[PDB]
């Protein structure tokens, strides 16, 4: 994990997008490629569409996902079993 | 006055000074029993003096560096055998008959490309 003395990481552009989204009141799904940004408390209730490699998947943020990374909720690999 | 001898074995080199005395052995400012605790190593060191029947007739001041326990003990016998023949040339034949005059030239074989060790080869499989 990122060192605590550095604080959590989040991309500046997504941080501004979220700040605007909380300000306008908006709930239009937020499009982002920042799988690496930490989910912050003010993200709760917003829908963030996180890129997984080919498509943005809607992630409705709850309290429990705070501290995680956005990419933890957009699986990149498609697997349905062998001999299926 | 002192009679000198240089002994070498593996990566070890020993400086042996002998003089008429009552059987003191000191290696690197420590007693023979303190420096070596392996019984094989004190015996090797003792091998030359207990062959020219002078266990207590010559004093022994020794320094040694390099290699480990067996290397340093062999370096010392070799260096005592060289000190004994400085004292008296007549016992050279008896020292050489025991194999003490030879410098054991066996050394660690280098590691080689494509081998795990000097000779150990990676496991082979036909298919």
């Amino acid at each position: 994990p990122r060192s605590l003395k550095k604080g959590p990481f989040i991309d500046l552009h997504l941080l501004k997008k979220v700040e605007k989204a909380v300000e306008s009141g908006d709930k239009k799904p937020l499009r982002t490629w920042s799988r690496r940004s930490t989910i912050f408390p003010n993200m709760i209730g917003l829908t963030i569409a996180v890129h997984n490699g080919r498509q943005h998947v809607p992630v409705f943020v709850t309290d429990e996902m705070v501290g995680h990374k956005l990419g933890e909720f957009a699986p990149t690999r498609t697997y349905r079993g062998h001999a299926a | 006055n002192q009679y000198y001898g240089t002994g070498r074995r593996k990566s070890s080199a020993a400086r042996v000074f002998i003089k008429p005395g009552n059987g003191k052995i000191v290696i690197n400012q420590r007693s023979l029993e303190q420096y070596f605790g392996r019984e094989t190593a004190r015996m090797v060191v003792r091998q030359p003096l207990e062959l020219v029947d002078m266990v207590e007739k010559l004093d022994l001041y020794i320094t040694v560096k390099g290699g480990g326990i067996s290397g340093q003990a062999g370096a010392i016998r070799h260096g005592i055998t060289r000190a004994l023949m400085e004292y008296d040339e007549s016992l050279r034949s008896e020292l050489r008959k025991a194999g003490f005059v030879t410098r054991d030239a066996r050394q660690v074989e280098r590691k080689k490309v494509g081998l795990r060790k000097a000779r150990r080869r990676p496991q082979f499989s036909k298919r």
């Binding site: 429990e64 996902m65 990419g71 933890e72 909720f73 001999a83 | -």
Partner: protein
């Protein structure tokens, strides 16, 4: 003889015997015994009942046994409900910490399943 709701071996040294408690490894065992004034090479059999109550109070400061099991289960279950990659790896019984699965992974996958 009985601590934290389980029986601990009477024939063993105290440090070893205390590790029978779910949640007490060697380090916690030494800490518990140091804080209860009890030596480490003391067999559990040759301990006064008062010393055993001291050990019980020391163990009480740590989360152990069923409480620890509930905590661990709650953490896994939270991960699994969350649907995160870690939780999905828990769901499928596959390695969770990024290990290779092309080969090995047999502790998570279990015995080989022939086609």
């Amino acid at each position: 003889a009985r601590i934290a709701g389980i029986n601990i071996p009477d024939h063993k040294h105290a440090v070893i015997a205390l590790t029978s408690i779910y949640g007490v490894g060697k380090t916690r065992s030494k800490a518990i015994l140091a804080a209860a004034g009890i030596a480490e090479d003391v067999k559990i059999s040759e301990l006064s009942e008062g010393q055993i109550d001291t050990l019980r109070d020391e163990v009480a400061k740590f989360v152990v046994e069923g409480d620890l099991r509930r905590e661990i289960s709650m953490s896994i279950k939270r991960l699994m409900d969350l649907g995160c990659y870690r939780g999905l790896r828990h769901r499928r019984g596959l390695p969770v910490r990024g290990q290779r699965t092309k080969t090995n992974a047999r502790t998570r996958k279990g015995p080989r399943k022939p086609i």
